[PDB]
Amino acid sequence: VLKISTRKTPNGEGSKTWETYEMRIHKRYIDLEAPVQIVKRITQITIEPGVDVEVVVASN
Amino acid sequence: FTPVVLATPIPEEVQQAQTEIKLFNKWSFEEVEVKDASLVDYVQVRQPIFVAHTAGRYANKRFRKAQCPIIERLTNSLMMNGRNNGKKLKAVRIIKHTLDIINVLTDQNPIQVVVDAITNTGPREDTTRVGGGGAARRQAVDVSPLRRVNQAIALLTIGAREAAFRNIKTIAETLAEELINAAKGSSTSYAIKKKDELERVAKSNR
């Protein structure tokens, strides 16, 4: 949960009213064991705007 | 008391004095009566407990404050003036010590010495700020048996609090000195002083 707190006013007039904006970042990981085709296949068949995808090879 | 044993010891002063009767720290709740009617139902001394500390919840419905033992209601009124707020553990240690001092000074049940003090200090009648007209005079209303316990404890702690300030004694001492002078209105008790002052005023402007 990203949080940003600012003052509602530009400049400094009025009762001191604050705000707080959020950005919510959801992470999860799925493990698979698949040969040549099903690797790049699975990366591009399941793609979507807004959703970031990155695949790690293995080990180190 | 049929002392049973298990893989992790558990002391003998623990097994006995507990599983038989649910004493206080180790004082008995039985054989202690509120020696004044009209103040029972409120001064709660009938449900026993070991330490004057519980996850209470007496500020939701109005009168629920009464199913709270007066011991813990006494302790809770100890922890005040800014520097003491919230330090309950300290207060229970004060009160536990206050009862030992009392018991020594006059046999009896210390928990009875306390209950005695609350009853004899709650003002029977009191003064209210009536309209009066200009120099607003007063009127002499009576005070609730809930307040009779409320303002009592209130006086019995403000007494021992202001007593043991820049004085060589401790809180458990000036509280065992203020409970003792109130368990039998010695009139050298700060509370008894205020009490016989309210009733005095409430008798004079009626």
Partner: protein, 63 residues
Amino acid sequence: TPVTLAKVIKVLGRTGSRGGVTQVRVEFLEDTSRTIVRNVKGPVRENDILVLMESEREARRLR
């Protein structure tokens, strides 16, 4: 020193301009055949027992 107990039957409302005083009706404990209206300071419900100083009085409206 004569002292009279009194048990609540019913609670009227609340007087005093600030709202401090509460009117109530009580039995006379030792004698059920009496019934007097008194002014109170603290919070009073039903069945709780007053402690009357002067056992006559019986007042009413209060600011």
